[PDB]
Amino acid sequence: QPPEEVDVLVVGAGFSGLYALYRLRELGRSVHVIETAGDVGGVWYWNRYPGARCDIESIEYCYSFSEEVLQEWNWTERYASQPEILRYINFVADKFDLRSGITFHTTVTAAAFDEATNTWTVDTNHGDRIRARYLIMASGQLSVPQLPNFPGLKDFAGNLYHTGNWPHEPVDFSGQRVGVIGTGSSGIQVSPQIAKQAAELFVFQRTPHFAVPARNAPLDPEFLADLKKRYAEFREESRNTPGGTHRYQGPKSALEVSDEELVETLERYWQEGGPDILAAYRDILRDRDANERVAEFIRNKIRNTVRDPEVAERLVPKGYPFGTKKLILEIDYYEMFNRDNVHLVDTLSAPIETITPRGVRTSEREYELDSLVLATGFDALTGALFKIDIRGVGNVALKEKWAAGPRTYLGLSTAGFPNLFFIAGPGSPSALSNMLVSIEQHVEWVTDHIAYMFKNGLTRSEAVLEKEDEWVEHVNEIADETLYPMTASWYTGANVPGKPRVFMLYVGGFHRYRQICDEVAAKGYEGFVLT
Ligand SMILES: Cc1cc2nc3c(=O)[nH]c(=O)nc-3n(C[C@H](O)[C@H](O)[C@H](O)COP(=O)(O)OP(=O)(O)OC[C@H]3O[C@@H](n4cnc5c(N)ncnc54)[C@H](O)[C@@H]3O)c2cc1C
Numbered sequence: 001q002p003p004e005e006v007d008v009l010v011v012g013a014g015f016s017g018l019y020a021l022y023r024l025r026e027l028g029r030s031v032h033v034i035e036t037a038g039d040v041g042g043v044w045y046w047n048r049y050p051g052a053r054c055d056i057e058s059i060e061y062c063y064s065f066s067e068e069v070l071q072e073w074n075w076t077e078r079y080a081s082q083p084e085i086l087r088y089i090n091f092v093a094d095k096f097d098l099r100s101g102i103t104f105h106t107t108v109t110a111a112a113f114d115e116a117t118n119t120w121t122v123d124t125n126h127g128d129r130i131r132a133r134y135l136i137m138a139s140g141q142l143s144v145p146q147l148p149n150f151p152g153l154k155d156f157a158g159n160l161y162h163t164g165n166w167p168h169e170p171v172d173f174s175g176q177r178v179g180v181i182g183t184g185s186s187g188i189q190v191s192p193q194i195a196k197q198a199a200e201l202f203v204f205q206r207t208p209h210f211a212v213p214a215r216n217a218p219l220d221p222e223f224l225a226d227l228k229k230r231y232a233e234f235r236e237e238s239r240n241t242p243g244g245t246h247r248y249q250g251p252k253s254a255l256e257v258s259d260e261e262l263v264e265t266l267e268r269y270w271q272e273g274g275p276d277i278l279a280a281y282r283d284i285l286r287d288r289d290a291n292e293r294v295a296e297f298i299r300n301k302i303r304n305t306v307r308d309p310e311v312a313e314r315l316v317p318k319g320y321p322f323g324t325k326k327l328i329l330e331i332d333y334y335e336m337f338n339r340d341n342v343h344l345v346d347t348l349s350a351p352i353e354t355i356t357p358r359g360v361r362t363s364e365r366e367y368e369l370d371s372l373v374l375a376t377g378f379d380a381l382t383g384a385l386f387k388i389d390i391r392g393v394g395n396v397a398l399k400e401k402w403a404a405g406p407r408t409y410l411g412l413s414t415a416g417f418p419n420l421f422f423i424a425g426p427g428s429p430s431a432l433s434n435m436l437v438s439i440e441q442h443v444e445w446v447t448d449h450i451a452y453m454f455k456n457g458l459t460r461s462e463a464v465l466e467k468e469d470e471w472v473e474h475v476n477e478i479a480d481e482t483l484y485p486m487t488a489s490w491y492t493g494a495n496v497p498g499k500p501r502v503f504m505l506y507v508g509g510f511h512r513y514r515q516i517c518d519e520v521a522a523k524g525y526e527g528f529v530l531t
């Protein structure tokens with residue numbers, strides 16, 4: 001139940017928030033968190049759908065700031081399930097007594113910067129008004145569920161769910177005719193789970209996403225114990241990579257190798273599982289012909305997965321470069337379509353016309369359903385800020401500054417909004433990275449800066465408008481040497497009608513981005529106006 005005056009206010013208590021809280025306390029600053037949720041966790045509190053699971057190996061997707069935590073915590077599986085990750089987060093929160101720094105059940109609704117006093121005034125739906133010198137937005141990247149765009153949702157007679165705001169008490173689909181709309185990551189995890197309770201499962205595909213097998217496995221406790229001996233060293237290796245994990249960076253071009261070496265090299269990634277295929281050859285993101293060679297191996301893998309070819313070809317991702325939507329790890333998802341209580345409804349060929357109260361009508365036919373699950377993604381990267389009335393200098397709304405796309409210096413800050421910091425968001429590596437790496441560096445960097453403002457008795461930090469401008473053109477130029485901008489993904493805002501179609505992330509790799517952030521801090525925060 002919030003203070004009235006705080007050195008730094010933080011929004012959200014997922015990985016970013018909790019680290020921010022801890023580190024700002026270690027730095028002898030007053031600090032408080034405001035969080036919509038009932039408890040700590042962010043995505044891992046929200047997304048309790050059955051099947052929810054990490055894409056990055058447990059040993060990678062975790063904090064490194066605390067040596068004790070590395071030592072004590074025991075991961076059990078190659079990819080943590082959501083409850084295990086939530087346990088981890090609750091564990092870390094207990095260990096550093098973080099909850100006394102967090103007001104739960106409370107959404108921030110506006111914030112306005114008082115040029116008179118170099119300070120932010122932050123409002124909430126409960127009615128609290130807090131005044132802070134610095135505002136840290138740790139409100140995540142995928143934290144505002146997107147409904148799909150059509151009519152008669154309100155009308156549906158059965159039960160309705162978004163994966164991203166799933167109920168707390170487990171949901172029973174036993175006996176039910178169930179429909180899932182969305183075959184993203186969330187769709188692909190949640191479906192094989194639902195398929196096991198329900199009498200009939202209908203899967204509403206628009207564009208096929210690319211997925212490879214996770215080959216999850218138990219985590220050998222010998223190996224864990226071993227790794228613990230050199231944990232910090234291992235983490236440090238992950239921090240000096242483009243992607244923030246131990247993925248091997250293929251030195252070769254997917255064009256230079258023969259077909260035989262191609263198939264044989266990719267068959268090895270396929271047996272092993274996980275995302276490392278993305279970096280099998282250096283030019284898979286940089287050259288349509290390179291990418292198409294990998295992409296085709298994948299599609300055949302998918303064809304040979306499903307007994308019936310008609311069904312199989314509808315599962316085959318067509319239209320766009322492999323790796324340019326999030327690459328998805330599947331567990332028994334394609335196998336699922338062999339079960340005869342599962343049906344793939346292709347909405348490319350037969351659009352969804354409306355939801356009726358009895359279910360879902362396409363142009364071809366209607367589908368009667370007792371339950372319907374939306375796995376339809378999130379208003380991404382900007383979604384969550386946009387729900388807060390954030391006003392900068394001159395009373396400029398950020399919602400408007402950014403209306404043609406996010407405009408940031410390093411992603412960390414935007415000009416015209418002193419003392420405002422975005423954690424792991426547009427302008428930065430963000431979700432193109434093991435996010436615990438992207439997130440730890442940002443918190444470190446932001447909180448170093450705040451510590452350093454206080455050390456030097458300064459009170460106003462602002463990004464310089466031309467540097468912001470130079471940063472944006474830079475983010476776009478590098479995006480444009482890759483294949484990313486070419487496709488409609490949440491990365492480009494394309495999953496939301498009317499959202500400006502810009503590739504929003506920094507594609508240079510984490511290591512490079514940190515280097516830049518470091519040279520910047522080294523020079524007294526070049527590109528900021530400090531007063
Ligand atoms: C299902 C799912 C799985 C994921 N898998 C991976 C993965 O495998 N690897 C990876 O690297 N990343 C993945 N991520 C990306 C994910 O964003 C990060 O890994 C990380 O969990 C993000 O944490 P965060 O602190 O940035 O914010 P979030 O965990 O998104 O937390 C933000 C918090 O702020 C709260 N909040 C938002 N607005 C307000 C408001 N106005 N007032 C008060 N509170 C507010 C939200 O409720 C939320 O609690 C996944 C994302 C999803 C959605």
Ligand SMILES: CC(=O)c1ccc[n+]([C@@H]2O[C@H](COP(=O)([O-])OP(=O)([O-])OC[C@H]3O[C@@H](n4cnc5c(N)ncnc54)[C@H](OP(=O)([O-])[O-])[C@@H]3O)[C@@H](O)[C@H]2O)c1
Pocket residue numbers: 053054055056142147148149150181182183184185186187188189205206207208326328329347352375376377378431490495
């Ligand atoms: C770690 C891990 O495995 C994990 C697990 C879960 C999430 N995550 C992370 O969060 C991000 C989101 O993944 P997600 O599943 O929640 O959402 P998505 O990826 O945006 O796909 C939305 C889906 O719904 C379909 N769709 C959208 N609108 C539609 C419409 N109007 N009509 C009909 N269909 C509509 C849309 O169809 P299409 O043709 O591509 O627009 C697509 O099928 C991920 O990338 C990860 O970063 C990670």
